[PDB]
Amino acid sequence: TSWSDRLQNAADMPANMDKHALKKYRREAYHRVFVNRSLAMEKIKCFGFNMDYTLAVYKSPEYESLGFELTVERLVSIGYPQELLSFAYDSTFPTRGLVFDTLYGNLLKVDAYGNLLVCAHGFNFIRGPETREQYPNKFIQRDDTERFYILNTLFNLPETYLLACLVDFFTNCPRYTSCETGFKDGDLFMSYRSMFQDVRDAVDWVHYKGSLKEKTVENLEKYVVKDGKLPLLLSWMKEVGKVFLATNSDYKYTDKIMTYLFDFPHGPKPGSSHRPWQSYFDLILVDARKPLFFGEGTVLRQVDTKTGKLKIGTYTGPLQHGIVYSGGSSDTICDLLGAKGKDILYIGDHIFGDILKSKKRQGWRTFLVIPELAQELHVWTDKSSLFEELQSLDIFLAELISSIQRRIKKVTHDMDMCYGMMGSLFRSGSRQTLFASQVMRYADLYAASFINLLYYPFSYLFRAAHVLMPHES
Amino acid sequence: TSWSDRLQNAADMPANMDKHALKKYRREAYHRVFVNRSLAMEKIKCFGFNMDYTLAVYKSPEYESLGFELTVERLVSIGYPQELLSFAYDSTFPTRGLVFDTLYGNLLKVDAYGNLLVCAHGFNFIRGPETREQYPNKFIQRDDTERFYILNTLFNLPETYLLACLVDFFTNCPRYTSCETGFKDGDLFMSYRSMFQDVRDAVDWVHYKGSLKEKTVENLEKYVVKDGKLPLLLSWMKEVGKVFLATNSDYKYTDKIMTYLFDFPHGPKPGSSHRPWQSYFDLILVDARKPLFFGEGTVLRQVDTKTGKLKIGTYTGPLQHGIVYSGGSSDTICDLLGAKGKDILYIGDHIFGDILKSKKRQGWRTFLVIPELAQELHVWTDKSSLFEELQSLDIFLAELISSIQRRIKKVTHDMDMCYGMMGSLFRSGSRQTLFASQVMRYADLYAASFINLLYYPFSYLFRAAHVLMPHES
Amino acid sequence: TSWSDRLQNAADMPANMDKHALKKYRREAYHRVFVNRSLAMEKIKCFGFNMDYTLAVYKSPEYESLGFELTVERLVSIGYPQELLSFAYDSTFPTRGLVFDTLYGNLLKVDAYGNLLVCAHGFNFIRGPETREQYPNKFIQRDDTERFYILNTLFNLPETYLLACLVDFFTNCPRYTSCETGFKDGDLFMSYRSMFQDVRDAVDWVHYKGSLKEKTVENLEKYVVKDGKLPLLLSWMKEVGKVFLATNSDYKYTDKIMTYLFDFPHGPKPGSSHRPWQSYFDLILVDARKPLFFGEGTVLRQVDTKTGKLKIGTYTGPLQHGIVYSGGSSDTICDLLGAKGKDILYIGDHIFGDILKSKKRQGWRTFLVIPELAQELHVWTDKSSLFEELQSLDIFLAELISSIQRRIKKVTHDMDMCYGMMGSLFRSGSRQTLFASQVMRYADLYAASFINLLYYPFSYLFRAAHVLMPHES
Amino acid sequence: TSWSDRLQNAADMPANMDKHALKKYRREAYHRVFVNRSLAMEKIKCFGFNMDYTLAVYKSPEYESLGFELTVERLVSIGYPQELLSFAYDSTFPTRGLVFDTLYGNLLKVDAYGNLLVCAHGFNFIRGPETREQYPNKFIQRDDTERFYILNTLFNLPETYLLACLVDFFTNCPRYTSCETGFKDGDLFMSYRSMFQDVRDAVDWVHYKGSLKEKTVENLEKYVVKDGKLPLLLSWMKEVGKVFLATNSDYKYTDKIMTYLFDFPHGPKPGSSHRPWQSYFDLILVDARKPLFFGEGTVLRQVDTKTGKLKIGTYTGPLQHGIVYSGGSSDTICDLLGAKGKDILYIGDHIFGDILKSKKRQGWRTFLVIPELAQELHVWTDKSSLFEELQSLDIFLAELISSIQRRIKKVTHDMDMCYGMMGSLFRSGSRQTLFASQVMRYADLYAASFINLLYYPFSYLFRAAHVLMPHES
Ligand SMILES: Nc1ncnc2c1ncn2[C@@H]1O[C@H](COP(=O)(O)OP(=O)(O)OP(=O)(O)O)[C@@H](O)[C@H]1O
Ligand SMILES: Nc1ncnc2c1ncn2[C@@H]1O[C@H](COP(=O)(O)OP(=O)(O)OP(=O)(O)O)[C@@H](O)[C@H]1O
Ligand SMILES: Nc1ncnc2c1ncn2[C@@H]1O[C@H](COP(=O)(O)OP(=O)(O)OP(=O)(O)O)[C@@H](O)[C@H]1O
Ligand SMILES: Nc1ncnc2c1ncn2[C@@H]1O[C@H](COP(=O)(O)OP(=O)(O)OP(=O)(O)O)[C@@H](O)[C@H]1O
Ligand SMILES: [Mg+2]
């Protein structure tokens, strides 16, 4: 049971319009919207969306496995060994938000301060004392972006596992010699950095020149969650405000995906005429190039929606019915919708490119979709006994000799393994991950899906407790 | 009663060595060490210090007023009008951590997200609706470091007030025309940006080429807090670990100041022989050039302590008794003391250049000295009734029509004015400042003075509660 | 009769081995090697080559016209108007080395100092006084590389004409409004800068992703000069020194082209066994990425010559028979051949990327191939009467009222038109072009083809007269 | 007899106004203006000047020796050894335009292509074969500006000799160990790069914070050439055009120097009323910051000529009588004088900062003053027999075994030594220097002094022969 099984299960249910039914459906943790900073929904005047993994939630593990298979086949195509074709995607290994150390070829799970929580070389999990040889302070410099790459997105899940697969394969294949910073093959030396770049280039290629999009759109039921409540919720948003789309994807792909998402024999509610997906948006913008979008952006272009090509030249005209934009900047949206930043609730899945950047650069209000939360919540509530025991051990030790520390490490591991080999997205034991810290800092609201907004009235006041400093308590 | 009066009051008392006396003296909020993240003191192997406003705490408002007077006289010297000499430093106006907007000439107090809490043009405090003309989203882009300058340090307090003085003077002087981005004087236009640069250059000049240091060292009793407990605490640190000094100041000034700080007719305790200040340090490093120090740093030099000049060449030798270093990098300290980052507790007063940077770049443990906390604590506990009323108003409104909002704004202002015209260092009403957020994020421990460590045993476990995400609660 | 007709005519003749026959064949200006700086051939130990337009001389105007047609069809493919398909390449318009001014959409012919010699907007040649509106000092800043693009190569000849075609088309097409910096089409504004970028991108695309290479290799007789003297001369070079190839092209294309160039029923001389083209080289390097090659270069790779793919990893081994390199740097060649810069004569056609950069960065000796010289020489000797008259007019005026200036401008134009609409590669009248100045400064030797070296003994001392300053004469 | 003795000798003579007297005085090579590119003086509408070493020609070797002594005393002041005080400036060693290699501590004389002509380590002149260890291709990369510093100016002559003095001193002083890249002194290593930086910093300090200016202005007869013909020539220029001053020096120094230069008991001619120096200029601009001046420049300021301080603010007004500008850009001059680049003859002594940059960035006409030419001409004409013999040897060898090469090297050295230990500014034997090449390329006119313009009518056509390519001859 993957997180997308949970979402597609909730998606299959009819949308009860009764006001008591929505407020009661809101009880389950799975249907809740979580609040890091208070937000008065009545002040929101524009609802903004990205598409991928927000409106178009790709089914797991089928879509990761497709991306993994095409990336492997691209690497074999450029000259990697045929043994790569015997890899098979394993959804139990990767957790999102890991850091690949391109110097030593390690996947690292770190906290907000660069402290090491988990270190794996290939499929070998390196224990505390052994990591100190490569990480003397059990710490990485996050600003060393040439060395460390943060695997922020769900699109990065196939390459997260692929990187570990490759390190494992070259380590144990007799043809190659293992060195500290790569692998030697006779007169050829492949550094982990160059291998990582090949992987990155191949993932990009699969998405932009390969067949991933084509294979997705030829079997949309297999790869994309479809929910009749999505048109309903978007129609409610457009009744109280303006609605816009700003996606990094191109128009031809967006049109195919969005058409599928809205292909029901009715409009927002059963019995209503079907409307085209574009009619749900006051402003549609593709090729957004986020996060650069939230700074200078790019030249504003207009899409010829008949051919799917860009019209030649910079678009200098006004917002018109049926126009589709390409490129531009976040200021394009604000000017054309007559919005200020805090009037906008932007719903995205990219913690860095959508949420952090719109918050810091423009002061937009933010809603982070976290697809895996649909299943991490289930693990969290089911295995809560282990966390409560861990909390007790931390408290008992905080007042105590060392037989407790071995029990702390033991329960930490058992808790983490319920999530997978790389543990929870949000923590390792009692230590929070970098990802959790960035969710708390930059996502005003968050949920497994933005559809959970259906269960709250549009006057709702999302409330978070005020923060106090230690000396103020 | 300034914050330095509080510190000098506590400094004048004898250090009772009784173990029950120290743990009981620790009760008062003023003698406490506050904890943002848990820290086991037994793991600390090196105690590091800066000098200015940490070991050498400059008396307020005398030192700010001296800096203000010399900066004004430098500006008049380069051609600013004689009316500047009628300014007089006013300690009730500036709060530390304000942002000067060089485009519009405003002092801004902002939260961690760039939201405006206070805006003053000269001495005119701009009310909410009027700020929207210049700040349409009541928000500044903090990454626009060419436009916004954060006045982080206590050394910036004179220029904080001076900037407001200058804007006020040119606005109301009939010879000048007020424009949006500066002042016009016939065929001369002085932008707020160029005026700000003149101020910055003059403050730098006063510290590095003018007479500020000379005037300080010729009346040390007037300008520098002296505490007999400082040699005592440093001697205890050197009994359990190593102690180092890394100051941005030069050796000749450091030697004069430190000699004064240790000039008592005894050593650590009354009855003991006096020891030179240098004997309290395993490593002394001047001209540190923090924060660059925590990256590549500069070439490591050796001070000729007889002449006070640098020896010619890069120092390639080892740590030796009596050597004094200049420049280098944080790695110099780690290598020479055989320390890893988390072995080091670095005690500093510069939230950015000492604390944020050593934490993020090197994973050092951090102790932030906040001199004004000695008096902000007194205001906080005395006027606690206003904050509790403010908390009630926020709760009552969070469940309610708009007669409460005017009461919220009214109590916010009355609370803030107890701290001064620019309010608390840490908040405006219920909203925390950028400075408060950076203290919580990067200072593991903090206190009005590091001397408060005297009241804790060196095995102490400083404890902070574990953080949970909203969905984990 | 194009310049490549001249070369292919000389190519069709048998190579007479008689030593008196070669030294006599050297009399014609067309078979000479011209000398800017003295060069003793006996000191040359390595002969280096690029491939395109040096070993593989593409026939004119067929190859330019092919490149023009595919670039036009790529622009139409991305959305440019169908009228582009009615353009047809005209070899009489473009001269190499022109500067496209992306601000005003002009093709400029300039001297070494940025002075304007010719200015054309579309097909309209702007006369002296009219250029002063856009060029007040009849001068461009050559360091403004964001505004001015120098069309250095023969590959740039199709886009030189295409840029003029496009400016002409949009100017005179009623659907578009002509503005100073581009063309307006309703709500779309296309700047000359964005149009220029589209052209550049399309030319790149045609060469790297389109069908230009495929169409060339499917009709090599139509597109590539073939000379039996090329294997002969290369074999003589390998008898006295080492021979290397460093091409920006990839191995699969290089192999196809070079195989064709060496496909004769014999080896160097008639009657000898045929040898593969690779056997003529001590070192073969593709994907050179010149001019970056002459600085840090790129990682050194090894080509799998069976598949045409790069082997995975950096090549760390030695120079071996049959190895083919990819990337690397000029230091790769020097180290592997045991050469110093002045031991190397590098034969190239790119005045900037081959000749200027190897000379300035590495002190290599240089031989510039200038394909058009084969025909510019014929025009120069035939129409010499006009130049001599021009020289007389300059002398007579230099001692004289203004009826001479109109005659000077008149003869200048008549002389220039013999070369084409944009005049000689090397001058406009008595003023030398930027290109001529860079040939003189950075090409030690030059010729229409490097095959002219066949007519000189390998002990030859190429001689240039010593330069004196004015005060030394 | 120094070059400034020649200039001061010519300066002491009365200015005969007879038109035949001026055209006859023009015969001597010493009074001629030399021409690299033709220039019609009637087209010049503005005459521009720098001050230092153009209007204010500092006497040699007294001024170099003063600069040397103060720089040495500054280095001793910061901690260099006392033995430096026994150095004494030697005008026979330095030639202008040498390159200090900061890696190996060598002074290099190079040609325009980076080829080594002379190499000296300290006072040891390294012979051809021995230089190949450090310079394998007898070549330096001029674009490696972090390694190589070109000593372009007459102000650099003291540090040219000082650098050789220091290398010589540390090499032969027993306390220091000689390494390839510097000197070791126990645990201190001083690289040639850091030593070079100390020298550079000290020269800057002497000019901007030390006593060099003060000592110059207290003995102007000792240090500055004074010529009654200078006011005369400037008055003739102002009769036919506009005259401007753009100096890097500050106003207080400029005023002192210019007052001295114009302090005669008469105006332009004997018998005329004296006029203040400022009245000879249509535009006076100080603090020019050339060469940045010829790009974006700096903010335009106005000097308060009463106090010598800058007025506060950017000057936005027009050109007015008596105004003195500070900063700005070359566009300031063009706009205020209504000039285009080719209307301007700019007379400067800095081959890079005045001449190269105004020519390339702005297309100004250029006149380079070369003070040493006053004496290099005398050596050139006196020792012409050696050069003619050298030319014969080159011709005889160019048609010849190796007994001639030793004679070529022998005569080259004897010729060079007549100029000094580092040879002619313009050549070593038959090889031209980088400096000579840049004079020819960027100086339209040149002379030992701009005063030589007095001997030419303002309608004069300076003529240079047209350049032909080898294939055009
Ligand atoms: N999740 C992320 N993915 C990719 N890049 C990131 C992410 N978070 C931060 N960055 C960028 O990586 C660089 C290094 O980050 P840095 O060490 O400055 O931490 P930071 O982003 O300031 O986080 P914090 O303020 O919590 O320390 C920064 O320029 C930042 O913008
Ligand atoms: N207190 C400070 N004083 C001066 N500069 C600062 C301070 N805090 C951050 N900076 C620097 O200012 C620049 C702009 O900061 P930015 O907008 O990235 O916020 P940040 O430092 O990442 O804070 P946060 O992560 O809390 O948003 C950054 O490069 C940062 O290093
Ligand atoms: N033929 C060329 N094609 C492309 N770029 C060039 C060419 N010649 C020079 N450049 C580059 O263009 C930039 C601007 O050149 P710049 O104005 O400095 O002239 P330059 O190359 O120094 O020529 P010169 O020394 O003759 O003035 C330089 O960085 C230079 O390397
Ligand atoms: N006389 C000089 N003094 C200082 N810098 C110079 C001088 N001449 C050139 N430079 C600068 O030094 C850098 C390196 O020069 P580079 O190797 O490009 O030669 P260049 O100036 O283009 O000369 P050329 O065109 O004759 O080769 C350039 O950016 C150039 O502007
Ligand atoms: Mg998305």
Ligand SMILES: [Mg+2]
């Ligand atoms: Mg400090």
Ligand SMILES: [Mg+2]
């Ligand atoms: Mg080529």
Ligand SMILES: [Mg+2]
């Ligand atoms: Mg000068």
